[PDB]
Design a protein. Sequence first.
Length: 589
Amino acid sequence: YSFKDTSTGHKNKEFVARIKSKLDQGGVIQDFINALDQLSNPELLFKDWSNDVRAELAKTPVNKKNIEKMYERMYAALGDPKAPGLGAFRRKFIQTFGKEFDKHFGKGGSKLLRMKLSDFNDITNMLLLKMNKDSKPPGNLKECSPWMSDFKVEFLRNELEIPGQYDGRGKPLPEYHVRIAGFDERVTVMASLRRPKRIIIRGHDEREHPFLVKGGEDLRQDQRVEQLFQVMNGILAQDSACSQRALQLRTYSVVPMTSRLGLIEWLENTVTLKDLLLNTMSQEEKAAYLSDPRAPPCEYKDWLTKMSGKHDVGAYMLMYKGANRTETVTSFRKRESKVPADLLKRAFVRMSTSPEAFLALRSHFASSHALICISHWILGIGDRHLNNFMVAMETGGVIGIDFGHAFGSATQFLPVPELMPFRLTRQFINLMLPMKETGLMYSIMVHALRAFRSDPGLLTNTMDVFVKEPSFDWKNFEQKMLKKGGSWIQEINVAEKNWYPRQKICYAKRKLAGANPAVITCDELLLGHEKAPAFRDYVAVARGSKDHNIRAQEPESGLSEETQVKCLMDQATDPNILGRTWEGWEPWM
């Protein structure tokens, strides 16, 4: 908060103190947060503290009081092992990490309290490198944060009321909202870069509720974009021509319990898109798709080797200094022609039992996927890779999850950018044969984008929570934009109020008032890859050709709606873009 305290700062201070005393009702909520914190891997917070000390001491030793304010949390968690037992209940794995890390932290506590070294990091990097041998994240039970496993409610401690309820509309009548009464022994770890956990908590009426717990990321961006989706299907179901089609985005609840601790509602009876495709295939198909040098797995890497000589990241940089246009299309169609041409069709006749009903599962799938690919562009979300789309195996509809790059941020700070606006690849148009992606995945996009260009004020007005309070993900990269970037046509001294967020709201207001979707994809590429080695080839690929693409025969602004979605779909499916992208996005399937 950090009040100013000139005239009314005192009454604001005592008012916040009044509420801080009025809430929290003793000791169930704060140690709920705490004992949920104390089960994650200590390596993630270890590298987090390493990042925040390398970024704030190793560059300039003038930042007064910030190191002495940030070593308090490093002293608390992974410090002296009775401090976790004082602040909360001590776990069963910090008593094996602090039991090992005593010699290494003796010199830390005795001289790295006020170190002022700023030049060497390998003395710590070798210990975090060797520490990943006796790091076992599976605690194999629920005793690994032993307050929830010994919860055992006994009296009116002002119940907790399992979070992620109170969805806005309606006088709530809170006697129905479920209350926590236990946890299960079997916990699971996920499959991501830092592997968040998945818990099986129980309601007060013997109902399982699973949740996804992640303990290092500030989940306020996700809360604001699910807030945006609530505005989005509040403006959809008011519109006339979209309500007959009954168009709605399907959301899900995410609560930021505190900074570096949030909960995600895990959804049930759903399966990811890659698992659906990879299990519709036959047993003679999958092994030859996986383990062939002519399979599109290894053929792309051999193309990376034979195109520019490099064998790793940066080959995509030297590929823009490699092939020409009419090499990539011909080397790409033979990559597209190695997977079977129908997999969603086999997956929709494998489960629909009737020719009346195959027709009506397919229209629902295609209309829902059209809706999320047009609403994933206004607020411009990138990284639409294969495990981000989640189909619902009881009604046939896709749900979109895992939002990392919210506004135009996939094509700015990533090494090799992503230039498509969404994911409309080959299988999504082979589903609709003998037609193609012009009948049903077109008028849905026109109706949705016409509703969003009806009243252009609502989403930009909701976007101002980002400018009234910047999050942690919009200040760790704001420094990178400050040290290298653009935006010198605007001022810098009013930072984070009209420099950064008025830029993002300016971009979304441009593409909501009518902008060429090749212009934005190179403006956001100029503002993050100016003075690049291969920058003219980026702005040459993502601009058109004027002989083969309609996105080069149209002006930049004042553009119309049907024309805008037309050049959008032209930018979406084009083998020039999809021939040279990131190898984990899998643009061929």
